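Q: Second attempt. The first request was missing the SMILES, so the protein and VU5 are both included now.
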Amino acid sequence: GAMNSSNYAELFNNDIKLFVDDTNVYRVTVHKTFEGNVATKAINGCIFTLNPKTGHLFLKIIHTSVWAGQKRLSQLAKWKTAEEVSALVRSLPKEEQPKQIIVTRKAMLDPLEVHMLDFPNIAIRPTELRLPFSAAMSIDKLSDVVMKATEPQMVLFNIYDDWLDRISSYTAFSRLTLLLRALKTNEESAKMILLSDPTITIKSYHLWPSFTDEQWITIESQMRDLILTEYGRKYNV
Amino acid sequence: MNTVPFTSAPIEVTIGIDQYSFNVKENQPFHGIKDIPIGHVHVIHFQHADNSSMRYGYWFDCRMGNFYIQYDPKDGLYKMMEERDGAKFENIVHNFKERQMMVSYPKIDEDDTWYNLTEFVQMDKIRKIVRKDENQFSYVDSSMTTVQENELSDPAHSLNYTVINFKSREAIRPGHEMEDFLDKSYYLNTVMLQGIFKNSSNYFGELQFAFLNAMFFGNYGSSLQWHAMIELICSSATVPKHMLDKLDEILYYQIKTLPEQYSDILLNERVWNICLYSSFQKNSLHNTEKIMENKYPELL
Ligand SMILES: CNC[C@H](O)CN1CCCC1=O
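A: Got both inputs this time. The predicted holo structure:
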């Protein structure tokens, strides 16, 4: 059934599973037309498919040409997401295929179930967690590859960089969700925290800065402050 | 007109015959039902006075044999049986009529209700759904499960209806996933109508039989089947016009006949609101929508 605070440690056991987040698949800007009506212009999107144990991210870039001539794009986006996830699974060797796929939005359940009918033993699950994966496009390197794409493309990343050399996947996921929650609540502040000190750089093959253990504790504490603050700035407390 | 005699009525029971019913007291001198219209299937059904649990009954067609009812004190129920000695049967019936020990099938001349509820229901199809090939009549009761319910336990006592499942490979063509899930026309017209049912008459007959088993026996799996068969049509964008017109009539008479007090358990809010107000056919069931809005506006 649904994934929640109670069964949270299941994410870090040895059953292969993937989170799928579709919130950045169909992206638009809204603008005025010369006649003063409103129109949308699509921009490139991405499916965010993440193994929370290993950090492997399958970033399927959605080029705006896929929407050309199509109607009801928000509905189509869910089915396109399920089509691409199903194609990813079929592309993986049997021993790499997931045993569960957890969708971050319940509207993905039926599209993914229908696309995965060939895989009756892969469980499709919702979650009660309010995960911040929409903020993935606030990670500069991910946003850059999505916006530069001229055609459909899949790009592989490790969203944990090398953290698993020193910390557990439970702890790595907690750091990831804290960073992303911060970036979602106040992107400018979060990004200032991460890059303030110019002596700490991002390796070419990494997404985040090369913090020491002690610096991650400081960083993590600065993100928590940010989140509580904005939670006041928002609710006045 | 045909007759179903009763050997006797040893236990107090409410007897149904089609949409009619009457009470018989313990050891009351009751010897059956006469004037049963030829040309239709019929159902004779029972609810004991002591155990309202298990409604049960028998689908039959008097053109197929001479049938009678006899209580079995070991199995504790009224059983339908066939009399092969046609002379013994005519003699029995004539004696019971002369002694006026039979109730008359109480059909009003104007009244087409039973025809309208059984228009497409055939005894040959009912016997394939309910298997006991040695009898020409078919037993059904409140507890019997469907093949589909069993997949999700005795197969001899099952209802063999066609299994309808919108999230199944049978329903969804590879590469048409979104198309086939949001518009079920493929599944209705090619899978269910042409390769399984064979024509819309077999389809409607199974849909009518499922409703009648839900209404008369409270058979839950039959109710599931009835709603699935409605929803498959309403969720198809491409339906033959004659089928939509006939469905509106079928459902109108079903809703008309439903006991006002059982609508809470026999009508699925989600299916009906979807079918009448969201589906491709939301504007195609005028008679059904009108009676539903005037009889059960709460459900909607
Ligand atoms: C006994 N199962 C039969 C299914 O429910 C519908 N079918 C199959 C062929 C003709 C017909 O009416």
